[PDB]
Amino acid sequence: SELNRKLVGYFPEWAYSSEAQGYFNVTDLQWDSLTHIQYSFAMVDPSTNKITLSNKHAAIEEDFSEFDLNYNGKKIELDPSLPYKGHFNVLQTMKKNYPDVSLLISVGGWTGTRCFYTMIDTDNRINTFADSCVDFIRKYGFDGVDIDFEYPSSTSQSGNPDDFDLSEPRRTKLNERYNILIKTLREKIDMASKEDGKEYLLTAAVTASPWVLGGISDNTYAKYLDFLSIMSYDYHGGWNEYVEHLAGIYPNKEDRETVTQIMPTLCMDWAYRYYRGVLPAEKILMGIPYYTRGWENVQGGINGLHGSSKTPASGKYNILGDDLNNDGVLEPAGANPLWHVLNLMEQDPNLKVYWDEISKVPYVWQNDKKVFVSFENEKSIDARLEYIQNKNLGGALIWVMNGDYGLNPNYVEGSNKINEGKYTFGDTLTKRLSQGLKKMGVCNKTPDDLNISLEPINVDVKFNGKYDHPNYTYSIDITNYTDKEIKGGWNVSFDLPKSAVFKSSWGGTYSVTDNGDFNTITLTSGAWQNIAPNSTITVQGMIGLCFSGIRNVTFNGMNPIGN
Ligand SMILES: N[C@@H]1[C@@H](O)[C@H](O[C@@H]2O[C@H](CO)[C@@H](O[C@@H]3O[C@H](CO)[C@@H](O[C@@H]4O[C@H](CO)[C@@H](O[C@@H]5O[C@H](CO)[C@@H](O[C@@H]6O[C@H](CO)[C@@H](O)[C@H](O)[C@H]6N)[C@H](O)[C@H]5N)[C@H](O)[C@H]4N)[C@H](O)[C@H]3N)[C@H](O)[C@H]2N)[C@@H](CO)O[C@H]1O
Ligand SMILES: [Cl-]
Known part of the structure; x- marks a missing residue:
């Protein structure tokens, strides 16, 4: 179901x-x-x-x-x-x-x-x-x-x-x-x-x-x-x-x-x-x-699209506009139900529908009044x-x-x-x-993250960070809960949604591999970044734009199950 x-x-x-x-x-x-x-x-x-x-x-x-x-x-x-x-x-x-x-x-x-x-x-x-x-x-x-x-x-x-x-x-x-x-x-x-x-x-x-x-x-x-x-x-x-x-x-x-x-x-x-x-x-x-939004007195663009306007569409192009003070005077917004736009096109042969094959939505343009409505x-x-x-x-x-x-x-x-x-x-x-x-037909069931199928290791990987648009500065805390030191040169991987772009690791080296809706980021530490038992190491870096979270985290080819 x-x-x-x-x-x-x-x-x-x-x-x-x-x-x-x-x-x-x-x-x-x-x-x-x-x-x-x-x-x-x-x-x-x-x-x-x-x-x-x-x-x-x-x-x-x-x-x-x-x-x-x-x-x-x-x-x-x-x-x-x-x-x-x-x-x-x-x-x-x-x-x-x-x-x-x-x-x-x-x-x-x-x-x-x-x-x-x-x-x-x-x-x-x-x-x-x-x-x-x-x-x-x-x-x-x-x-x-x-x-x-x-x-x-x-x-x-x-x-x-x-x-x-x-x-x-x-x-x-x-x-x-x-x-x-x-x-x-x-x-x-x-x-x-x-x-x-x-x-x-x-x-x-x-x-x-x-x-x-x-x-x-x-x-x-x-x-x-x-x-x-x-x-x-x-x-x-x-x-x-x-x-x-x-x-x-x-x-x-x-x-x-x-x-x-x-x-x-x-x-x-x-x-x-x-x-x-x-x-x-x-x-x-x-x-x-x-519903629609739109503008009048559009300057530039092609059929209005990609033009500029400081005046949202008003009047018959804005039947859903807000009545801020109950005058019947509506705040310009170019806001209409779809049926009203169809009716406007019945009455005006120069209100015409166009198609954008990149965005894959249509739009309406009145070339004489310079009115664009989505x-x-x-x-x-x-x-x-x-x-x-x-x-x-x-x-x-x-x-x-x-x-x-x-x-x-x-x-x-x-x-x-x-x-x-x-x-x-x-x-x-x-x-x-x-x-x-x-x-x-019905949706397919998306498989679980692959990391769950890997052999477990008692390492905890915590991903945190701070966003200052358009830069996400990440900080990953890696805690070794095994009884033996993890030698430098270990690697951690995570899947970063394609809403964002990995920019740099601040230490060691990294690779980026396409993985569906994600890029798999692999951070390989330096030989000197040993993690002692019961100790934590932190690595940082930069990502462009934001993302809801990361997934499919691995450490040295294993599933980091923490403690
Ligand atoms: N240093 C600054 C620069 O940062 C700045 O550049 C701009 O920066 C922007 C970020 O701040 C950036 O992105 C835009 O940011 C603005 C906010 O600043 C966003 O604008 C908002 O967009 C919302 C939609 O996503 C609007 O919300 C809608 O508002 C309408 C009313 O207008 C509501 O309509 C009502 O709906 C209800 C039912 O829901 C109905 O009952 C009522 O009748 C309706 N009236 C909607 O509900 C509501 N969702 C919001 O109004 C609007 N302010 C915008 O989305 C971001 N893209 C810019 O790209 C970037 N240029 C520059 C500026 O030049 O200044 C420098 O100093
Ligand atoms: Cl908002």
Whole structure:
């Protein structure tokens, strides 16, 4: 079961009452194609440290009397035997006909991370929170918990600026405390599974940003997850001038934001390599956007791409923009669901779709208004399927399900109203993903690190280091726990993810050997670097860029089992 491909979709609690979101509700979910639904979003309560609803009315009270609950052709009624209404009732009602679709509550997000910062301050608060998650999934019929903490990183000024008053004083400890949080959640959830005779899940949505990851020093938490969802989107957008892809798959040496770095990092494939340090591919999901970002008055570039703009796209090119002060005046971002961009192209023959064969995503360009908007289409879905099969990925997650497209029942020829275009939300790309994931078959089981099959030696190898972008300075402590001195000229090897490049060893000599998603680094010491019994020697060096961890550590051709 665990090697099955996964297609994980985020459900937006806020969409059902919003014009720009298409009034999307639970009966509009792509139930025939998704394997998991992540409900977005719950939060942490500031005073009790327990899981809490964001829009309680939407989640458990709304009766949908003014909305249309219909699946296929049949009217869907709320189950009157449940003690709650809202989205949660509709989810449980649909689950009866889709018993193998897993439902998870997602805690966090960009605007729901704030009270994680105070909850992680003490072990008792973490225990309270974790217990409250168990209580919540039992109460509301969820199959698991997804943690979307944005972000448990020491990187200053990362995450929502509204929360700097809580995140900035805590930067040095966030990663350690997050690791404790995830481990505690796993322990409590596993106990609840045994008690209930049910297999509850724990997942996390995680950063793909090298900037954020530079402030993450311990990725052990990943081993406690059923799967790790890489947020391989928001790579580019209106926060800066670089007119570039939202969600590229492959490294692009023409991405102007990274053109001088040792490799292009703002693409799924770099994050894949990063996380291979701690997980097999079959536990990693690719993040796919069904939304856009974009710019207007683009200067230079070719069809806008690789150009510059200080003005994110506005107006009809930004229907999902934030209403910061409730004027109806939206903050420019070029942010749209995919169906709205399709409708804009129906109305404007000079808004045209292009394909980038390097990054393997499409984009839309209006050559007269100089408007560039990212895009996603059948061709990029197909490229993403190829990548998923080629890399043995566990599947994909989608942010967010109301951005996929289908034909609009409320289409009005010639209308410019948001919900009267040819297209509205639908399942076109999600069904295409589901079909491709079925066709490629289950994941392969990635073999264990080879070091476990080698003869053991009682040597302990501890790899530590410090990151000062773009340089990782490593320090490896080697402790001899045998009863005989280890002569100089010993060697240690480790597998370094291809998100990073080994630069130099500060002592002795080294070699680098290609090894799949890693380079095997072999450090051969000098004859004078003897390790006495019960003694420790330290060697250092430099690596370019960052990596989730190292694997497959050997010492003198043996497995260093420590003491
Ligand atoms: N010495 C300095 C130089 O270091 C500097 O060079 C630059 O340095 C950068 C590193 O600091 C480097 O990388 C970029 O770093 C910036 C941060 O500084 C990163 O920018 C952030 O990118 C995030 C995405 O990865 C953005 O987050 C998104 O923000 C949007 C809003 O804009 C949110 O949207 C909301 O979403 C919710 C749902 O989630 C929805 O409800 C709302 O309606 C939406 N509004 C997103 O949720 C959120 N994820 C963030 O805003 C942004 N600041 C960037 O990613 C890194 N690439 C640069 O490459 C390098 N040039 C130079 C500068 O020239 O200065 C020298 O002095
Ligand atoms: Cl950020």
